Ligand binder design. Structure first.
Ligand SMILES: [Zn+2]
Length: 256
């Protein structure tokens, strides 16, 4: 099955998912001199005051914090978006070392981790219909650099113990995602896809310019997770990041 090892790594995904070599693949390298400032681009609108987290799950390639998306409780709008996108879940991508982990790179600079807050267009009614459309999903990408601790992240850090291996889940209520956002909402945007199989090209990527810093110990716990299910040989969940894909004449626009 797909994963991130040498035998089932990102380099083999095309076999089972041909779209892997498509025209609007993610992630990509954001070249700052080449991105275009677009003044017609509106400020993002992040309204997460009413978000309802439900649980955290180790799905074998990461850990997802999932939200109640049966109503417009946590939404994202504005930016290069048209309509309302409801928050479904958030997960991360991290490395074995602080020197790598992010999916997107800036001027070829690799961050320690990358957070993805996944949202779906409500005119499609359900997440499942949404992935089938060109403007079905909106993902907020936030880079993580090692420095000072991120208070807002500790709640997550603390429950990882609980969902060590694939298939485990834990009750994860009352978690406010506002605690993971940077001060500034300046962004870069381009049309791309999911960074994991099925790699569908349904995403409008919104990657924040300003990184959030987390401490060395915060990041360390992410690395204690396992790709394997319980009672199986242990394989640390590290380097669950897909490398940069060809931009292929897509244009990266900047809000600043
Ligand atoms: Zn992701």
């Amino acid at each position: 099955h797909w994963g991130y090892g040498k035998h089932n790594g990102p380099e083999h995904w095309h076999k089972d998912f041909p779209i892997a070599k498509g025209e609007r693949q993610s992630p990509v390298d954001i070249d700052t001199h080449t991105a275009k400032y677009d003044p017609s681009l509106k400020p993002l609108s992040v309204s997460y005051d009413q978000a309802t987290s439900l649980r955290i799950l180790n799905n074998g390639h990461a850990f997802n914090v999932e939200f109640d998306d049966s109503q417009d409780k946590a939404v994202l709008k504005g930016g290069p978006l048209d309509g309302t996108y409801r928050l479904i879940q958030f997960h991360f991508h991290w490395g074995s070392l602080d020197g790598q982990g992010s999916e997107h790179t800036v001027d070829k600079k690799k961050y320690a981790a990358e957070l993805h807050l996944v949202h779906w267009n409500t005119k499609y009614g359900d997440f499942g219909k949404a992935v089938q459309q060109p403007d079905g999903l909106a993902v907020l990408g936030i880079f993580l650099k090692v420095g000072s601790a991120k208070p807002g992240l500790q709640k997550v850090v603390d429950v990882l113990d609980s969902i060590k291996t694939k298939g485990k889940s834990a009750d994860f209520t009352n978690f406010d995602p506002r605690g993971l956002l940077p001060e500034s909402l300046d962004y870069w945007t381009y049309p791309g896809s999911l960074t994991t199989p099925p790699l569908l090209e349904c995403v409008t990527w919104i990657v924040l310019k300003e990184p959030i810093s987390v401490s060395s110990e915060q990041v360390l716990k992410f690395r204690k997770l396992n790709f394997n299910g319980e009672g199986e040989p242990e394989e640390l969940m590290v380097d669950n990041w897909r490398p940069a894909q060809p931009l292929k004449n897509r244009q990266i626009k900047a809000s600043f």
